[PDB]
Amino acid sequence: STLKEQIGMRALNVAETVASTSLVREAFRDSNPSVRLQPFAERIRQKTGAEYVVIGNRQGIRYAHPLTERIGKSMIGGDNKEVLKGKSIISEAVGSLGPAIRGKAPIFDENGSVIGIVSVGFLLEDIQRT
């Protein structure tokens, strides 16, 4: 319905597409998943025009973020719990980069267990003039 709601639904479509990309689950088995995930997430961020395509593990530790300083630190916003249960969500929260609408999708392993999170966001300040 609203433009913000539609941007959220697009963000979740991107997050579920990223989460289902074979490279992403495979990279979780690497000694340092960031080596393959950071360049992949940056290409999707460029294609989609999202503020970020964040990829994190079950502890909320980032493997990919547009700011490399954020890699290896905890995701911010307090909206991971439902995703770690295997549910996709559209969430408005304050991330490290500020208030955003995010589509957040679980990453499943080859057995269907949740191993991580994809978060695709657009800052609220970019949806309408403050």
Author numbering: 32 to 161
What does the paper say about this structure?
Membrane bound histidine kinases (HKs) are ubiquitous sensors of extracellular stimuli in bacteria. Here, we used solid-state NMR in conjunction with crystallography, solution NMR and distance measurements to investigate the transmembrane signaling mechanism of a paradigmatic citrate sensing membrane embedded HK, CitA.
Citrate binding in the sensory extracytoplasmic PAS domain (PASp) causes the linker to transmembrane helix 2 (TM2) to adopt a helical conformation. This triggers a piston-like pulling of TM2 and a quaternary structure rearrangement in the cytosolic PAS domain (PASc). The contraction of the overall β-scaffold of PASp leads to a random coil to α-helix transition in the PASp/TM2-Linker. Based on chemical shift assignment (BMRB ID: 51759 and 51760), we are able to extend this helical characterization to four more amino acids up to I158, which is only one residue away from the predicted membrane embedded region based on cysteine accessibility in the homologous protein DcuS8. Structural changes include the P-helix formation, which promotes the piston-like pulling of the TM2 helix, and the amplification of this upward motion by the helical conversion of residues 180GAVG183, which border the membrane and the cytosol. The large change in quaternary structure upon citrate binding detected by CODEX, is represented by the high-resolution structures of PASp and PASc dimers, and together with changes in secondary structure identified by NMR chemical shifts, the mechanism of transmembrane signaling is revealed.
